[PDB]
Amino acid sequence: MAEKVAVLLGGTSAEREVSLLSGQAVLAGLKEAGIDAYGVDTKDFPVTQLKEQGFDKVFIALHGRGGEDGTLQGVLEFLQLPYTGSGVMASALTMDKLRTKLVWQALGLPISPYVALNRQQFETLSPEELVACVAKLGLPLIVKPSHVGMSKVDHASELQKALVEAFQHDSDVLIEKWLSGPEFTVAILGDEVLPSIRIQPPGVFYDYDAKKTQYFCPSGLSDESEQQLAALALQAYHALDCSGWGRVDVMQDRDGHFYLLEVNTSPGMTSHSLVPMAARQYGLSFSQLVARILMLAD
Amino acid sequence: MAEKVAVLLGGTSAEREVSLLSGQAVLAGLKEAGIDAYGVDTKDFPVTQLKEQGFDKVFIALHGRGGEDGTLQGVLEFLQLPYTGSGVMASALTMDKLRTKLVWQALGLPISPYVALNRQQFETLSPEELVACVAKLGLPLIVKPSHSVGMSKVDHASELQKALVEAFQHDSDVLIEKWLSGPEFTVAILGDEVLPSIRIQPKTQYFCPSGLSDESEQQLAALALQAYHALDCSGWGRVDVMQDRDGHFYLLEVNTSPGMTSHSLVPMAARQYGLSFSQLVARILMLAD
Numbered sequence: 114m115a116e117k118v119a120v121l122l123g124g125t126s127a128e129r130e131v132s133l134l135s136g137q138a139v140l141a142g143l144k145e146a147g148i149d150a151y152g153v154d155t156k157d158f159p160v161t162q163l164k165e166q167g168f169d170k171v172f173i174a175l176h177g178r179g180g181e182d183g184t185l186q187g188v189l190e191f192l193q194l195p196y197t198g199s200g201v202m203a204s205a206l207t208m209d210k211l212r213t214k215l216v217w218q219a220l221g222l223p224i225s226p227y228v229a230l231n232r233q234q235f236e237t238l239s240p241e242e243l244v245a246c247v248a249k250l251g252l253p254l255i256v257k258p259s260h261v262g263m264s265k266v267d268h269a270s271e272l273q274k275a276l277v278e279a280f281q282h283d284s285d286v287l288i289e290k291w292l293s294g295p296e297f298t299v300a301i302l303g304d305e306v307l308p309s310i311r312i313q314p315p316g317v318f319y320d321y322d323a324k325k326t327q328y329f330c331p332s333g334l335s336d337e338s339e340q341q342l343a344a345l346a347l348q349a350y351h352a353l354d355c356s357g358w359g360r361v362d363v364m365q366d367r368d369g370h371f372y373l374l375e376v377n378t379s380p381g382m383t384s385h386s387l388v389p390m391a392a393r394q395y396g397l398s399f400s401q402l403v404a405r406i407l408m409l410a411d
Numbered sequence: 412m413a414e415k416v417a418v419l420l421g422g423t424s425a426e427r428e429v430s431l432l433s434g435q436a437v438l439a440g441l442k443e444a445g446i447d448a449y450g451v452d453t454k455d456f457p458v459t460q461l462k463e464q465g466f467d468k469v470f471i472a473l474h475g476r477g478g479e480d481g482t483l484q485g486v487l488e489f490l491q492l493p494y495t496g497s498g499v500m501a502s503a504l505t506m507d508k509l510r511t512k513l514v515w516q517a518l519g520l521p522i523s524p525y526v527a528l529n530r531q532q533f534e535t536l537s538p539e540e541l542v543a544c545v546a547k548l549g550l551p552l553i554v555k556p557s558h559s560v561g562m563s564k565v566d567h568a569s570e571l572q573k574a575l576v577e578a579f580q581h582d583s584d585v586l587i588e589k590w591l592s593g594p595e596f597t598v599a600i601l602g603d604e605v606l607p608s609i610r611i612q613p614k615t616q617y618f619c620p621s622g623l624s625d626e627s628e629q630q631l632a633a634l635a636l637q638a639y640h641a642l643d644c645s646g647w648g649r650v651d652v653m654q655d656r657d658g659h660f661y662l663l664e665v666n667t668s669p670g671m672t673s674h675s676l677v678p679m680a681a682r683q684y685g686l687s688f689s690q691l692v693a694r695i696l697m698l699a700d
């Protein structure tokens with residue numbers, strides 16, 4: 114028998130409005146492919162009831178907290194419903210920038226040189242010893258919470274204020290060597306790597322506000338560089354145990370080498386979002402994209 | 412007025428019978444400490460209804476699949492009920508022996524030399540090149556799925572193939588590790604306190620105190636705490652460690668919902684630390700908020 118598919122959308126995260134748009138687009142793409150899909154605004158409907166309500170399969174179009182962080186995936190594993198995108202471990206692990214980095218680093222994959230600091234070290238160390246802890250990174254530096262509170266630090270004297278700000282939001286903090294850019298993103302669909310996209314933010318960070326931002330696809334990279342980036346992205350994604358689909362974010366340094374930033378396990382699916390753009394460049398319609406993502410669940 | 416606490420127990424995993432015992436003990440320990448606790452056999456009661464039923468707080472005494480692997484923790488996070496033990500990420504990460512190892516290794520923490528192999532490499536490689544892939548590990552070897560089902564001790568290179576075939580029945584990632592001559596220890600952690608280690612001898616024998624010197628116990632306690640924080644654990648858990656012939660410690664794994672029967676490891680360590688079983692479980696619950 115045919116499957117009843119729930120498209121989970123909206124929710125209660127900061128990204129609710131983007132997720133309503135993603136879910137609305139996904140819903141229309143699936144129906145255009147003949148899939149018996151229904152929109153479910155998880156703000157109003159508890160995801161714990163999906164099986165009771167008769168669903169066989171779930172397409173996840175939520176973003177942020179409660180969507181791409183393992184929680185929802187856990188609920189779905191408890192109900193034993195197949196769902197799109199990565200599983201519990203990978204969905205959660207990809208929210209943790211420290212542990213993401215550690216896994217990549219143990220596998221010899223390139224990440225920006227950095228220093229991790231917990232609250233305990235922050236409380237037992239003088240600024241001066243903090244400066245010495247990060248001296249080997251040079252300048253300038255990025256300071257961020259391991260899971261908002263981000264700063265660019267240009268001079269050693271600015272470090273303290275940045276740490277204080279970052280520890281407001283988290284008990285683990287990362288201090289990274291600044292990378293010149295540019296920034297890229299690489300979408301992955303099943304085992305296929307899609308064409309990369311170069312991203313130019315209006316300011317210093319490709320942050321929430323930036324997500325005036327410019328996107329280029331094709332990225333402008335040479336063919337050799339694209340092949341390198343594709344292979345690297347795939348490794349980065351398999352390293353964190355991702356599956357189904359996702360987006361890998363990457364940055365160049367001044368030397369032209371790539372460095373891994375993060376993997377996003379529930380990407381934006383609006384008409385103007387990154388994955389649909391890359392899919393289009395790859396030769397897929399939006400409807401084909403979403404039907405393919407669904408087919409890769411289970 | 413008082414918080415209503417659910418002790419989740421039993422369930423449907425292979426470890427159901429051990430979990431009924433753990434839950435029964437926890438339930439009695441919490442009541443003895445003055446907590447309004449109720450036993451909830453998750454085989455018969457769906458965990459998705461805990462809030463509807465009026466519970467405010469959950470003590471998790473399930474083991475194995477659906478208890479200590481992130482899925483239950485996800486349900487509880489969705490319901491927004493405070494619960495005992497580690498969160499989603501840590502509960503799930505600790506079931507992945509490859510990624511556990513990789514995180515520990517990137518932090519410079521000690522683990523046994525090993526090789527990881529996926530299905531693709533297994534399918535592309537002959538028995539002879541497999542042997543050569545692991546030659547640097549010496550003999551004997553432990554072969555295990557990355558996620559003791561499907562585990563073997565391999566004593567001779569010619570036995571490697573059969574062990575890999577068995578292991579790939581259960582997983583697409585397999586670990587081949589250098590065998591360690593022992594002894595084995597386990598270190599219970601409660602909030603930020605490290606409890607006394609227990610030496611485990613493979614009719615199974617447990618020694619607490621472990622027999623280690625004071626300086627070695629301090630080293631082990633610090634190492635265990637780092638291993639636990641490395642994987643983002645909280646609330647409580649058990650870290651398993653082994654020695655090599657020279658006395659160096661190596662991290663094996665972290666367990667995010669340990670056994671709580673009368674004869675289980677964590678209670679034995681708590682007792683040696685000076686806590687009654689009732690105090691132990693009250694402390695664990697207090698760590699949930």
Ligand SMILES: Nc1ncnc2c1ncn2[C@@H]1O[C@H](COP(=O)(O)OP(=O)(O)O)[C@@H](O)[C@H]1O
Nearest residue numbers: 225255289290291292296317318319320374375
């Ligand atoms: N080491 C770095 N050097 C330069 N820019 C960085 C660095 N790390 C992150 N960025 C910029 O900050 C943005 C956001 O940080 P990121 O680590 O991707 O996490 P989050 O998604 O939580 O903000 C990136 O997309 C990129 O523009």
Ligand code: NA
Nearest residue numbers: 181204207378
């Ligand atoms: Na994620």
Ligand code: NA
Nearest residue numbers: 479502505667
């Ligand atoms: Na676990």
